[PDB]
Amino acid sequence: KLNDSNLFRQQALINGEWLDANNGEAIDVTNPANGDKLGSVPKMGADETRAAIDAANRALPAWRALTAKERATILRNWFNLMMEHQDDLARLMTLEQGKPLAEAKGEISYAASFIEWFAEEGKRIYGDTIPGHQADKRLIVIKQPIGVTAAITPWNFPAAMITRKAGPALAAGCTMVLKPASQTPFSALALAELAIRAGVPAGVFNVVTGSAGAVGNELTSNPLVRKLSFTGSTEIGRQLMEQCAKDIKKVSLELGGNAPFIVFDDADLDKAVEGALASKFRNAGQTCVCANRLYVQDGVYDRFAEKLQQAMSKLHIGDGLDNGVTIGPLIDEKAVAKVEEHIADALEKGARVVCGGKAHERGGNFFQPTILVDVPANAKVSKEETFGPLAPLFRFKDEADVIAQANDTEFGLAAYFYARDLSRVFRVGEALEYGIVGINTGIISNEVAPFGGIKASGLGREGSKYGIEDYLEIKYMCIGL
Amino acid sequence: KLNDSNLFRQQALINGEWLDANNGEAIDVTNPANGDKLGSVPKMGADETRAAIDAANRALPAWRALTAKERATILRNWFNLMMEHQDDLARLMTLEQGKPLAEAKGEISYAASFIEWFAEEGKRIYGDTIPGHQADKRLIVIKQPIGVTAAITPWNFPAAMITRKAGPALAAGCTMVLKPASQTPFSALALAELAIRAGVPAGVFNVVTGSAGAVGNELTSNPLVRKLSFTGSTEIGRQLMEQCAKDIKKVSLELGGNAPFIVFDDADLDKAVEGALASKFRNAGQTCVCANRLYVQDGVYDRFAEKLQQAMSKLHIGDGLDNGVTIGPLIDEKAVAKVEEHIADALEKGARVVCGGKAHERGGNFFQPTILVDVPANAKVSKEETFGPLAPLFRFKDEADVIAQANDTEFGLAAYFYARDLSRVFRVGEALEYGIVGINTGIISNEVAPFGGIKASGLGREGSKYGIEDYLEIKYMCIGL
Amino acid sequence: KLNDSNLFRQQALINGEWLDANNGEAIDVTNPANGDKLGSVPKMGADETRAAIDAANRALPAWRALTAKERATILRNWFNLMMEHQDDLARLMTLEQGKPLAEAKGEISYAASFIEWFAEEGKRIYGDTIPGHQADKRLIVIKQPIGVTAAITPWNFPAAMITRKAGPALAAGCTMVLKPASQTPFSALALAELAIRAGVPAGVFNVVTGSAGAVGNELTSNPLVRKLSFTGSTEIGRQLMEQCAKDIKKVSLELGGNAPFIVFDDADLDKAVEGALASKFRNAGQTCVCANRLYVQDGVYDRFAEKLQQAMSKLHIGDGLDNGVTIGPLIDEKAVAKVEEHIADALEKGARVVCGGKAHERGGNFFQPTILVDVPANAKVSKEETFGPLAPLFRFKDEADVIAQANDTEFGLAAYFYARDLSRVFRVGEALEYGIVGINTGIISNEVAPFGGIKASGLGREGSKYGIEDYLEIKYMCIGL
Amino acid sequence: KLNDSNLFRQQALINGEWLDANNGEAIDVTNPANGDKLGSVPKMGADETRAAIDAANRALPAWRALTAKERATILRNWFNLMMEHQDDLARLMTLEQGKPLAEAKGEISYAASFIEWFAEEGKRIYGDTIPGHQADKRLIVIKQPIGVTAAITPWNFPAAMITRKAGPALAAGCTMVLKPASQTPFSALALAELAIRAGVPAGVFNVVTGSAGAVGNELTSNPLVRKLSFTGSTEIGRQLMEQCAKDIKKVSLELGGNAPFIVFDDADLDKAVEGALASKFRNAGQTCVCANRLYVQDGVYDRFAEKLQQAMSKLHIGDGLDNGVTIGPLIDEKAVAKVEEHIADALEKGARVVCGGKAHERGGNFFQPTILVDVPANAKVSKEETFGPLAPLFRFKDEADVIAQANDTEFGLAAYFYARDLSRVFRVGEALEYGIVGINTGIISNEVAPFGGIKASGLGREGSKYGIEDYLEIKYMCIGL
Ligand SMILES: NC(=O)c1ccc[n+]([C@@H]2O[C@H](COP(=O)([O-])OP(=O)(O)OC[C@H]3O[C@@H](n4cnc5c(N)ncnc54)[C@H](OP(=O)(O)O)[C@@H]3O)[C@@H](O)[C@H]2O)c1
Ligand SMILES: NC(=O)c1ccc[n+]([C@@H]2O[C@H](COP(=O)([O-])OP(=O)(O)OC[C@H]3O[C@@H](n4cnc5c(N)ncnc54)[C@H](OP(=O)(O)O)[C@@H]3O)[C@@H](O)[C@H]2O)c1
């Protein structure tokens, strides 16, 4: 398999040391395309996690004390190494998580861009001087690393989730203990390996593998951890925020979404269809910003449905390492069951399957890209994140009406719409209750803009100048002359 | 009492209406100097709070839709009214909370400044344009009001605590339901009255008085509330943050502090003493940023102690309405009990009373300005928040030792130090784990600088350009050409 | 006359004293509507200007040394006084410059807004801290007043031109010597009077009246003057910039414009006509941002021309003090002469007058609002600033053609266009070589956005956070630990 | 000689082509250490410069149209190449300009950092959105490249002067025509060569060699050039600013300095001496920020003078290619003469040579580091830029006195002072009329902070987030809904 075999790691990284769990237990990792065992990863608990936090704390003063340029040098080394080893990293990711190799290569590039961006940002952590309240007073604001930080990351973007958190943390001058998804830990550990090679000192970046709560409970209850960042389900987000209350930790969360994708009568339809295909079926729909509800205005509903159906039959389901495959398997059978459930629920409420609608002939974790039409506003899918390759099409008549429908949810991460009228664009863009709004495009991803949710969708922002804020503390100094 | 009798309110403000509780129950409010009943306020519960939230929700679109200048006009009217009625407002505050009239006048001025500052800041909510990731993409960031907000405020700064939250909320384009302290609600309600007179529309700013549980539980559990701001004890902060997890609310907290006040060998000792007197004994020590631990270097310990004792003998205890009174009573008998406990604890651990030491001859809520020496680091008085006119005094050797001692706490709000050497000032200023650092000054309060805590001391900042951020949501728009 | 007779001043203000010229010579000021003498102002020269500069220099340390808040108090007093005396100030302006009373009241309000805006901005002059290049280095940037400043202002906006320069100068902590237009000096002197009443100290703001080059030569050659701001003709801009080279003065310039006004096929035509009317005929076309060239796409040319002609009928010419008058006289005979020359030049090159086109029946400085068609691109009116009620109409074919035509000029001040298509709006908005671009609106004026030109049109910006920059010097401080 | 022989170029670079002058005339370049001919560069004039401007103009749309990241990729390649070829570039520079090899290597590294920094800054050109003046208005500010730019650079920092201007220009999206110093053109042309290798397209960066005004007259009179940046003498700065007035060009200037270096009673003397040695004798005192006047307080004057004299023994004069040489030759005989003239005027006015005092035994351009004492304020050296290894020592009594003396000059570039007292540091730091202030350090150079002068010392800033502003135009767009 790999050009560089040392990128494949079956041990956790704590304080510069590759280690097994104290008790020797491991978690098996399997290939979602076929069920084959790829390897394993330590099943760590509180004790190893505690040791990792103590290592992060011990390494903090010396990391914090480096110049921004010397941190930038190390981080840029990390970035360069990621790009150098791109092919191996992509292969590793396809094997453990399932997405097509081209998608995985794209993710490596995107993931790496966070390391580069924040290396640069670290040199631009600006304080302020503020005109004084009295002639004999001087006011200075500085921004300093929050300290030891914890990160919990999901399985759907096994590389980019890491770098979206480690990038700003390390560039801020913080240290980090990261717990990657048990289903896709290899990508995280490979990045850890490249961090060593880049010159990241022992204890500055630690990767601890184990079962959800064992590691997580220690991360949220240890007062040395001053900041937690989590990406995943809304329910676990709730529990983690509750747990963080004891120490009044600063918490960043990127949670559930239920993205509306809105096509107005004045849209460029071919572009809407391309946007919809890219937005819905990226990572087989296993994305927090995937179109989950497709609202199409009555004037263009029939034409759009036809074009979308034409475009969808062109997708190739298969093993993500094979030529021309554009839809891989879902992560597990639990993901499949949810897609199945959403389809059944839409049917019981009067929707019609136009195409797909069932598990793929391959079985296992493979599901057919599917289109539902005549989907009513009371359907589960209208309220609940699908996380799979299902396009449900909601009809609409009126702009005010669709805005009300789009916003009628506790979530508020990404939304998309297609329209050409300037005034319409402003009205809809402004009225949508979402943290991210794609306008005439289905692909919004980059490292330079703030990515995050409002409402039940989360707290804080990732990427951009705003992204590093969450890892800093403001200090106000008032000097008496 | 008052020049304008209509400033004294004994009813809550909901949706522009002055109301009693539905069940007509009231909370009595007494004068802490003597125990006299001043009046009462409604004892509202979930029902009235719910109705207030619904009013704030209803009022939000039209408030949000005003220009920043028209919001500024209304807020500047409120500011001007506060300053016009300064004398009445100060009197009202002295009567209900106890502080000397001059301190109350000072607080009105400071409280009002937040309204003015944020009126101005509202016009300066700047979005961004960011260079695109592709030639056919445009990136725009806008900042919009988070929506309906809740505020819970304490008794120690009965006017400033209101304006530090209502100012940025309203200027951001949010609406607000505020629950003021049951011991000092009149200040809040007078401000409410002036908000009506200023042109603040019905439902934009609501003040609900009642039991903490009954009002607070509704604030934290109603999903229409998207943001909570609280100032008070660390334990209630923990509970409120837990409760906010359900809706993933944005939370601002300003909590406990245990402020170290550090005097180095090279300090101006007369200035250090002045700063210590101002910092420790302001509001009789009932301040979240009050000096709570006095660290004085070996070389100057004896001289500082002598000078401090000279300066303190000049302190005058009495009714806050009387000439020359500089120490008023504490807020209630439990305030006294805590101070008494901290003394008892330090003595049992081998400390010495240098002056004060017990409850004043007047009795009731009055307490003797107290200094302790020979206090060990594990004493209640040096680990917990005292909120009384009691200071332990510590000797230290050098820079390294005192920094370690200063930072050896779960808190992180304010710290102070006195030194003249430039290098020392940077070293100590940077090393202190506090959100606020006073350097050669004991008074750091203003509206223009970010005020808040790190660690267990809070989340978010109040005042300054950063203050309004906590009430805004960032929206990223990506336009496809 | 006036409600407050002391607003009418016939003396200059130097160092808090109302003075005549040393030689007692005066400049007569006449009413452009009828030629009546209104009064006179001192005809000052180098001597009095030098004394004004010395007074500004002398007052600088104490003005600079005030807190931002105390400068804000004084400037807000000035703002408030301007609004209080709005009616008198508007009357005074209509009498001396000619514009309709409603336009003059509008200008007072707009002029005043600069004083308020900058009073606020003075409190928000932010320095920086920058991460250091070495561990033992600290980098701090502060912004300080440039020092003594000079302002030269034109006759077309006799109040707003003052406040757009004095506002940011005084808020920055600078002092100022201002030379107003000889044709409209009363508005400037009234403002000066209000500055006294507001608490602006002697020598902080001085108004010297006199003949262009005598006062100007002293302003540009005196090394105590560190900054010059000028609004007027391009040719005088060139000369003043040349003169400022000796001392390497910081120079702000707002110069000539030749504003294209572009109407696309997909425009809302009624809104385009309304915008065109407002943009072209405001201040009788005597505005640096007035539509000077009207480009209308082939598909809508005929309809637009018809509608514009209908709308122009409801403009009423007369004395600006009379009810319903919407076009006053031009400033003088020379202005009438330039409009006649533009029309004559157009006609001899094949142009055709649609309506108007001759001096008004009243004579003097009154001119008929005029539409010209068949105007060649080599016509004086398509190349030069007209500053009169003259609307030439240009046909166009496609977007790329009109952009090339709009940009084919040395000027680059304001441009306007009307379109509904989102992509078109971006393409055109981005490609126009102008400092200010109105999109689907003819009225772009406010204090909060940066106003200024590119190319031969000027240097620097007025209004906004960028406006105060031109009156500050950046100071970089590098501290060695 | 060089590792990479193609770095040594004897032709100009215009539109991607290496060219001789139209008339084949060349300028000889000699080694200042011995007078040897190194080679020559074209003696170009108006015609070639005009062709270069046309080439820059032609290349602008496609350079402007790239994404910020693709410009960053090209610029980072340039940076990397500079660091890769550091040894050759350093050698080339030492040969043509004379400075020690270690100084030259340091300049290459410093010069390269501007290219890196601005590559990063280009991705961070932020526009704004501003809250509207009316509910139906939206305000957007964008920042766009100013267009074709011209740069004129001096001989003292033959690499860093180029990159300080080309860096921000190209990162802004501008194109550039650069005229390097005729005495040190090879460094510029080598950088040009690496720009080709980096992927900088033809016409984006042009280097035209020629003698002063020939090239300069065309740069300043050609209206396609919209921005000029110049570093050199004050007198040429004045002339260039005058010439730029015709087109109202945006002008950046870094001119003469006369840096005061102030040592207070409470300074660390050994550190002051080290700082003074580094500040005064870097590049043999041929730097715009070199200490030119040494003010030492009465209490420490004698001790400082003794220590400075001891330290001046650590200076080793010779060929910059030889081991341990720390002072090279001056640039030419005219430089030697000016130093001899300053010493003579100082002695004529009563000053005394403590050490050195005349040309170095080698002759040619070699001069002895000199200390003067007993220097009066009327000496030329107190008013004029020496640009040579001459340290004059002034005695001062107190703070107010030295501040007044320091500021008593038309210059305002760099100043330095040594003091430990916090209050003193603020007082003096704030009161100094300089763009750059070193505090307890003699070395202030970096790419992250704004570098530039006030008063007659310049316009604009180089390095930092501010550095790019001078190369952008602000565009205000106002959208009507
Ligand atoms: N991009 C996203 O915002 C995102 C990502 C993933 C899932 N989801 C949503 O969640 C749904 C299904 O849930 P899921 O199982 O994939 O995600 P989940 O339960 O929210 O878990 C996400 C990650 O958090 C860890 N985790 C769970 N509970 C924890 C705890 N108490 N303490 C510490 N860590 C804990 C898990 O670790 P283990 O791997 O060890 O179990 C997992 O890697 C999906 O269908 C999707 O809608 C969203
Ligand atoms: N860092 C600085 O601010 C700096 C730098 C250099 C000099 N100086 C000052 O000037 C003195 C040295 O004299 P200098 O002859 O080197 O100074 P200068 O006359 O200002 O020359 C500086 C550079 O600008 C070029 N130049 C001069 N006039 C020009 C014009 N009209 N158009 C276009 N380019 C023009 C020259 O090119 P050519 O080589 O082709 O003649 C030279 O390389 C020093 O003693 C110092 O005080 C200061």
Author numbering:
A (entry chain A), B (entry chain B), C (entry chain C), D (entry chain D): 1 to 481
Original paper wording:
Succinic semialdehyde dehydrogenase (SSADH) belongs to the aldehyde dehydrogenases (ALDH) superfamily and has been identified and purified from mammals as well as from microorganisms. SSA is then converted to succinic acid (SA) by the NAD+/NADP+-dependant enzyme succinic semialdehyde dehydrogenase (SSADH; EC 1.2.1.24). In Escherichia coli, two genetically distinct forms of SSADHs had been described that are essential for preventing accumulation of toxic levels of succinic semialdehyde (SSA) in cells. The gabD gene encodes a NADP+ dependent SSADH (EC 1.2.1.24) and is located in the gab operon.
The structure of E. coli SSADH reveals four monomers (A–D, 481 amino acid per monomer) in the asymmetric unit, forming, like other members of the aldehyde dehydrogenase (ALDH) family, a biologically relevant homotetramer with the 4 monomers related by a non-crystallographic 222 symmetry. E. coli SSADH was crystallised in the presence of both NADP+ and SSA. In our structure, the NO2 and NO3 of the nicotinamide ribose interacts with E385 and K338 respectively; while NO7 of the nicotinamide ring binds to the backbone of L255 and G232 of the catalytic domain. Significantly, our results show that E. coli gabD gene product is inactive in the presence of H2O2 and can be reactivated upon addition of DTT.
